[PDB]
Structure formats: structure tokens, C-alpha cells
């Protein structure tokens, strides 16, 4: 199976490796679970916050459309061919693992849209955009947290697997190998002493007797 001479040197450092590594993986799991509890609570809140911010804005948009006397949304879709509010990806280290985050930046491609001129009713549409540009921004910053949360869930599973793996497989494999080789190695040495001794008793006796 394995060497009967000096498996002890490689095996000794493995064994220590394993228990040391295990302790350490537990701290990394503890940190990952530590953050995980916190974000789960923050994310449920953030869902309602986004719901509301969209809804209050969404209703104002509905009101603006019926009061002026025409449906704007068609005209708005046609005018847009750039996305004003864009995002920049960045990695933030939360725990051991890096999560993906988004920081919105506003780029001045377009300011409003070239469709308002609906006389008196047109001021209702211009104002409607002002209220929505602010609402969308709340959603986007909150939306960043959602991304990290999915990323944490994927990592925890790899991490739970490792903590089990070390304890259950590695540590008893090191134990069985080290002890079995130790026991065979000492045996070779002991029998030799007995064989040297056995012939020396024969010698001693022969000398002694006349």
C-alpha cells in the first residue's frame, strides 16, 4: 500500500495541515453565514422600498397621461435610443469572496425627450420625468445589493461542502496511515535486538563451560 520507512515525515505535516485547515475553513464559514443573516433581512426591506418608489412614481405617470388627454408612452419609446442612467461594475470584497456591485452613473446623452409641446398639458409630462428620474435612482442603488446576495448563496454551498469534506475524509485517512506505518517500522527494529541477543546467549554459554 504505502512506504514502511519515513511516511511519518510527509504524513505528520498532512495531519496538522488538515486540522489547521479545518479550523480556518470554519472561520471563513462563520464569516460567510455572519453576513448572510444580515443581508437576508436588508433585502426583504429593500423589496418593499423599491415596490413603493416604483408605485408612487408609476401612479403619478398614470395621472399625467389621463389628465393631459393623450397616451404619452408610445412617443417616449420611439424617442429613446440611448440609456441615460447606466452602471459601472465594481468588485467589493464582503467576507473572503468578492461580490459584484453596480454604481450608477448618469451620462448626459439625453435630457428629457423631444415630444413635449402639448401646450398646457405638456408641463404635466415634463414634471412627471423629474419625479421618475429620482425614483429610478433609488431602485438602482438598492438593486446592487440583490446581485451580491445571489453571489453569496452560490459561494456558501462550495464552503459547506469543504467543512464536511475535511473532517469526514481527510483526518481519519491521515490517522490510519501514520499509525499503521509507525507500528510496522518499530517491529523491524525490535526483532533485530532479539536475534542479536539470541546468538550472544549461545556464545556466552559455550565460553563459560569447560
Amino acid at each position: 500500500v504505502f512506504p514502511t520507512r519515513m511516511t511519518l515525515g510527509l504524513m505528520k505535516t498532512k495531519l496538522k495541515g488538515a486540522n489547521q485547515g479545518y479550523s480556518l475553513l470554519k472561520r471563513k464559514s462563520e464569516a460567510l453565514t455572519k453576513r448572510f443573516r444580515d443581508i437576508t433581512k436588508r433585502i426583504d426591506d429593500a423589496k418593499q422600498k423599491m415596490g413603493r418608489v416604483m408605485q408612487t412614481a408609476a401612479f403619478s405617470l398614470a395621472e399625467v397621461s389621463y389628465a393631459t388627454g393623450e397616451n404619452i408612452g408610445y412617443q417616449v419609446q420611439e424617442s429613446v435610443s440611448t440609456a441615460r442612467f447606466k452602471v459601472r461594475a465594481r468588485q467589493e470584497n464582503v467576507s473572503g469572496v468578492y461580490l459584484s456591485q453596480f454604481e450608477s452613473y448618469i451620462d448626459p446623452e439625453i435630457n428629457d425627450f423631444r415630444l413635449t409641446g402639448l401646450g398646457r398639458g405638456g408641463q404635466q409630462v415634463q414634471r412627471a420625468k423629474e419625479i421618475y428620474s429620482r425614483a429610478v435612482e433609488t431602485l438602482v442603488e438598492l438593486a446592487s445589493l440583490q446581485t451580491a446576495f445571489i453571489i453569496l448563496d452560490e459561494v456558501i454551498k462550495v464552503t459547506n461542502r469543504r467543512v464536511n469534506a475535511i473532517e469526514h475524509v481527510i483526518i481519519p485517512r491521515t490517522e490510519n496511515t501514520i499509525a499503521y506505518i509507525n507500528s510496522e517500522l518499530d517491529e523491524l527494529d525490535r526483532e533485530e535486538f532479539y536475534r542479536l541477543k539470541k546468538v550472544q546467549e549461545k556464545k556466552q554459554n559455550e565460553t563459560a563451560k569447560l
Partner: peptide, 11 residues
């Protein structure tokens, strides 16, 4: 170096 091998570092 043992810590890079053992945990299998992510940072």
C-alpha cells in the same frame, strides 16, 4: 503559502 493551499484562497 500553507493558507493559500489549505483554504484555497479567494483573496
Amino acid at each position: 503559502e500553507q493558507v493559500v493551499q489549505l483554504v484555497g484562497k479567494s483573496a
